Amino acid sequence: LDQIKIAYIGGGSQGWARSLMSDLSIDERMSGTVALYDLDFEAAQKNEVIGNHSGNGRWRYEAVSTLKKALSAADIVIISILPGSLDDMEVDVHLPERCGIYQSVGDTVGPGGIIRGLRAVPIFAEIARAIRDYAPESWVINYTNPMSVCTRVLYKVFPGIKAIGCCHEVFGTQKLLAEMVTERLGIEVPRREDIRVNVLGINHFTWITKASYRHIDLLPIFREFSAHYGESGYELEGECWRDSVFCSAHRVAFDLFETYGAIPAAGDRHLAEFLPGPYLKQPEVWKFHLTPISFRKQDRAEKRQETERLIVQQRGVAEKASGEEGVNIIAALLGLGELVTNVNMPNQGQVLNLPIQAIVETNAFITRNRVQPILSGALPKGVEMLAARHISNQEAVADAGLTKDTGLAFQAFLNDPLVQIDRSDAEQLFNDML
Amino acid sequence: LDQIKIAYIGGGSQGWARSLMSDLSIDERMSGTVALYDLDFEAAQKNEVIGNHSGNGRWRYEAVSTLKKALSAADIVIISILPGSLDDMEVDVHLPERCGIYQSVGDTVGPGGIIRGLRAVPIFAEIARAIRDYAPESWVINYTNPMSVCTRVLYKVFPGIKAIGCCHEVFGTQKLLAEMVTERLGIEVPRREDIRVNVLGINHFTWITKASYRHIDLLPIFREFSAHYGESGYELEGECWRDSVFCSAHRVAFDLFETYGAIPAAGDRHLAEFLPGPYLKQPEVWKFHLTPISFRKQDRAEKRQETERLIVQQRGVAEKASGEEGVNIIAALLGLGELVTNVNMPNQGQVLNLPIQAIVETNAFITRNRVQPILSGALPKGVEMLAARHISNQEAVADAGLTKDTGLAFQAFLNDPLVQIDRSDAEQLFNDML
Amino acid sequence: LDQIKIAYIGGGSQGWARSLMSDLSIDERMSGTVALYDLDFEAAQKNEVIGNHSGNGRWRYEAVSTLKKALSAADIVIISILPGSLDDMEVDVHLPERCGIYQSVGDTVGPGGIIRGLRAVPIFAEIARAIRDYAPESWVINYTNPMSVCTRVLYKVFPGIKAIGCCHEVFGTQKLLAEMVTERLGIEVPRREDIRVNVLGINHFTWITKASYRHIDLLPIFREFSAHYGESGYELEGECWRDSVFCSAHRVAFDLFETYGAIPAAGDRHLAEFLPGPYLKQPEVWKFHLTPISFRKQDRAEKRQETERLIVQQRGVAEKASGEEGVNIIAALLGLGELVTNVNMPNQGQVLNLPIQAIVETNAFITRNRVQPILSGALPKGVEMLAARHISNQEAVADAGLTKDTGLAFQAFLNDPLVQIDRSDAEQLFNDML
Amino acid sequence: LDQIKIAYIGGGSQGWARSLMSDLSIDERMSGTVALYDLDFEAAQKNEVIGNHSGNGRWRYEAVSTLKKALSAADIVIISILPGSLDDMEVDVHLPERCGIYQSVGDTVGPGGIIRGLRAVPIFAEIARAIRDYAPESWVINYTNPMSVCTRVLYKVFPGIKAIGCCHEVFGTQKLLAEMVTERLGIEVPRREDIRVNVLGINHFTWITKASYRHIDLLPIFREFSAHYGESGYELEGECWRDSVFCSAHRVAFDLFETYGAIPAAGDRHLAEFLPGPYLKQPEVWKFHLTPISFRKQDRAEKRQETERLIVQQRGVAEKASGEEGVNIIAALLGLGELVTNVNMPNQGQVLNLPIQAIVETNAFITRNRVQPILSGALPKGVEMLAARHISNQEAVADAGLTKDTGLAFQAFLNDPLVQIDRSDAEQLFNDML
Ligand SMILES: [Mg+2]
Ligand SMILES: [Mg+2]
Ligand SMILES: [Mg+2]
Ligand SMILES: [Mg+2]
């Protein structure tokens, strides 16, 4: 299928865009052009050079100067931006520490997530309007965090938009379950996709209430697995939890499973931000890490060095699967192979007992021009109470951001499970973070 | 996967049971036993002998004398019975003709559909209580008509039951569309499965609002197709609409398409009973047939002869795929595959603007011990008005049956599109049919 | 309370306007001005003249030539128009007779109701825009039929409108029940207001599921009353059902009660148009009348002579209570009393199992700048089925009118219980009336 | 109306019991008997003796020793109990202080409310079964706290029960508003009931979003009132906030009003427990009191002395109105005078965006054998978020207490706005309070 046009917003991205370049370079099902748009033209142009050195020539990349130009005639829109700068992020993630509040990531919920979301609203409002004006029939795939707020803003501003949010966190839990099947049953699992899960919740706080490998029910096995490794934790093969800030021993997941009876389906570093527990103040004991801003600064600098190397040497990205589903979803949407995978979309009943329209993560059936959520049922009662509460806050942030009502955003702030400090301290903190 | 147990209610069946046997005999994924139960033990016994002459010895068949014995330890329950005798049906289908009302099938809606549903209610209440008592955790596949009422009674009497209703009408529309692709585009379609349709409605009144073959949108093509063959009709390769009471030239489907803008997705003979039209009074002009009860008595008699033939020649069923999805669905339910196919289930949002709990037909994602409806959107407004109306009637019939409230059943009777006679004529007709 | 401003759209009226003038001229709680608007300026003028010969000069009347002028600074907007002329109405009501369709009133449902609705849509869309632009904060009282459609158009076009539909039909059944108390119990009833009823449904198809007079439950009593007079009918004291086309012996209401078990709460002449029955073709057996358009023409001519009589003698209307609740609702809306009375308003749960947003009739609590519906429960099942079906047609008419979609209008026409003819006869009929 | 029977559960009361006796003795609209039940039969007997010296002998009182005897043939059931004892309550209210958590009342939300709820659940389950068994048609009026949880349990255990919860808190805010009209307008207000408020929320956390005195809008006036007296607070005529643990200067309400823009409608001492604020830590700054359990024990001893005084003096209660609406509501339910007043009932739409079935407080229209909530619209967004959260907790408690699930009760405990401590601290506290 030729002459596909993909518009890429955040096209100077050194993460999602690269990962998309790799997968495009190996899918023989498709060809076309990628319009790269970034507030920072310099980064977009380096991606144009790197992309045009990747794979066949199957995909032609172009750094473009405006949104309108990127979207014109686009069939797919990909969005992967950073709402603000590393300096903003420093505040997002670390300022609350002066009040005793710790955050492992800060891009989804808690104080960081609330404030980052406010900052993201007008960015997404503006993108929704551009997509409405220039490519209203395109499918939009959002990678940006906080994911529930960004995606929801897309639908508040352009009600008829065809948009999904994509996240890779559930994939990590499927891998965990694939290795468990081997360790507990001695049987090999070809691909993590073969771990068939009924996953539901909201981004970074998803839960698996049924799971199987072929004819085998995985829940009772996860029961024993969790019981055996609850204290020690469990490390993936060839990994140690201290290898990087992204690694863990799944102690937080095991602990949540004991309490709620569903399998937590995101990394420990994400799960820990959604509810009360000793996790965030004793990460070493719980065998995961917080991600500090020094890490992000360092990582940015070595991605920059990598980028400059690739150019100097006139190389493209590895022609190697990233493990993402972005290109698979795009192929599915174009009618080149149907797919059932987890996505974030407005709730119309696919998760029971949660507000309708709220952005929820579930399996969906994806085929030509169609993303169709699958009814996935109910969360455990305790998790549902927590999810309703976070959705409350997320809806308020999206509204607060569109109408510029800081009073309402502060209500959300005060309603967040991590903001457990006196009201006047929180107000000073909130105002300082704005 | 071995030692699976299927309970078959209506196990003397000479339609669905045979098709199930053929499909079982060629699937190498599974093996176990089929308990055949039927009020008429003689027929079940004959299916037992034909069954045990079919395939590899993969499946062992046993005719059993009671429901309890069929159900105990059952993993799957299939239901394919006739609610009443063919003598009862002669009344369902032909008596209203004295008041000028013709029916082509009379097993779904109209006067015969209503009376028939009424009769089926206490049969399925009893089946539901037995499944609850002996096989609470089995999956139940219902094939019996009136589909929406029977299936609904299962859930009303056993709210926790795991039941779907299955029908093959949508397959016939998929085959029609595959042939249209070949005729309009000149390209082959290898399987009717490759016609990926978004289908929705209630049984025998299903509609396709989106459809594709690979990258191609089929809806614009069906519009051309319909304009070209609207008058003359269109006949499947190597067929003539006169060949049997089951055949047509799709004139009714083309006519409904022009009116409603979605593709009607059942045979003309079924569609014709759901709405006002010239159809039922001029079936030969509309190029389809009515099915008189004599045809069914005749068909049954030649099926009886065929059955005696196989018993004499000590042969089993044809080891040939039936075209049905029953066995594929069972395999998916056991975790031996995953499948997206159309089924009947309680509405929890998969069809918009239709009462919740009512039995609707949509695609559903099926995997180990999971049937999960796919959100399929809205019908055309005209179609949705009719469907809400029939659903009203179906709900009232189910209630009327469980509470023996003939007054309420008469209200449904009166609300049926085919009953356009004075109220006293209808009351007299209704009482005669009871 | 003084300097109230009321805008009257349709103020050339000779029904509601005159009746309003009476009620206004005797309420001591209020004073202000009435801006009379009417396509026919001359007739608005004559109400001006006659209004200004009424009351104390408590109310100053003024004919105004434009909506905008009328609406400016209005606290209350009253709408009482005739959608089209009496000649149009001759078509609505009598043309269908050629196909054997009879109508008693034809301003609400049936073929005449549908066509009249279509006609009234653009007229109400226009009024809705004016109110939005010139008097968004006013309370709006609609008296025009077809009530459910007109009022719904108001909300569809101006979502934030504060609008109710008012009808006097229920008062008639309250009067009936008041006479029944006297006849069955010997005790006097001071006012029909004291018959405290739980009323619900849609305009002209309202039902009373609970009723009382002080401590006495009227349902069991109506049951006896109904049993005793079902065959003979019951005529109001000092009345004979033949006195006028508005009179009846309640035989239809008794018949509907026996079937459904709630008290129908509109005149037989309206009820008879909503469901199948022998009523319309045997009006004398059922002791009610059809209203031919010749009667409306005669009636209008005398009202016109009366008009000119008053103008010639410098006389106004009579200072006498009309029996309506209009002025009393206005007073309650201004804070000068509070009130619980029946109104038509969008459904938000006040009637169970009926679509939301559909215009339904229930009791509401009315107070300063507030009309708040009272949860009234469910209709009997057969009645709910009928009402859902009418609501369906009504929504379809509203949409059809707003988008100019005759195709949709015809679907509603086809779905109307009074339209029991062949489709092609109905098509010809529909086009002839359009 | 004579021979009415009222069952009083908790008929040993020295609070709601006495207030009822007073009000009964002055209402000449009614006559009958009161069956007094109380786990402490001697306390019920004393109310019998005191009761049978009260009124004209309008009401005869009888202490009965079983629920059966109390309930059988009852028209009205009143429930006014203390769930557990004053020692249990000492734990509810004061134990959490060891963790830095203060509570002003502890009978509604927070840790004490959650624990008291668990205690009340089985008591109300037992009462609901008895009412189902012996007086299914009675109207049930609940006064017991925790009110939301207590009333809900009645409906969970006996779904067809006819029950409301009654509380007097909103009356206090109507007085405030009455005195405000006089102070700000100089004009007098005859009755707190003339302050006509649109009130909604959950018990002890109700809000008034519209309010008036006749033609005057009270909200703009409360805005000025609140803005003037926000710092000083405002004391009622002839009152000083220090006068008793029940008084305040409305500083908390004024503060909530500035933040949310709706008039909070419960005393400061209840409001304080529902959200984060500095209120409970600086009560003296905010001009309200906490209620120590030592005060409750002293109050109980003085009530025991008054009881003995009345007996010895063979005096009944005073023939003086209590200010409650209890007897008024009873009269209305018997058909003796319709009434619009605030009650707690399952949510079916009367409050927007709040789960259905949940016990919510709004106006209802009460008449013969009918309590019909009035649609009251939405809370301010920030208040709705808090109420949904508290409702989540109340539903968890109702279930946990029935099904015994301390796991679920603990999630509710952790989701309560007053429990802002480490999870292991919370678990130790929670376990201790069990
Ligand atoms: Mg993520
Ligand atoms: Mg079928
Ligand atoms: Mg009317
Ligand atoms: Mg209270």
Coordinates of C-alpha atoms and ligand atoms in Angstrom, one line a residue, chain C residues 16 107-108 143 145 147 166-170 203-204 270 361, ligand 3:
Chain C
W16 CA -55.1 31.2 25.1
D107 CA -53.0 17.8 16.0
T108 CA -50.8 15.5 18.1
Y143 CA -49.3 25.9 24.5
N145 CA -49.5 21.4 19.4
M147 CA -46.7 19.6 22.0
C166 CA -48.5 23.4 29.3
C167 CA -51.7 21.4 28.7
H168 CA -55.1 21.3 30.4
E169 CA -56.1 17.7 29.7
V170 CA -55.1 16.3 33.0
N203 CA -48.8 15.0 26.1
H204 CA -52.4 13.8 25.4
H270 CA -57.2 12.4 22.4
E361 CA -45.4 15.1 31.1
Ligands
MG3 MG -53.5 19.8 25.1

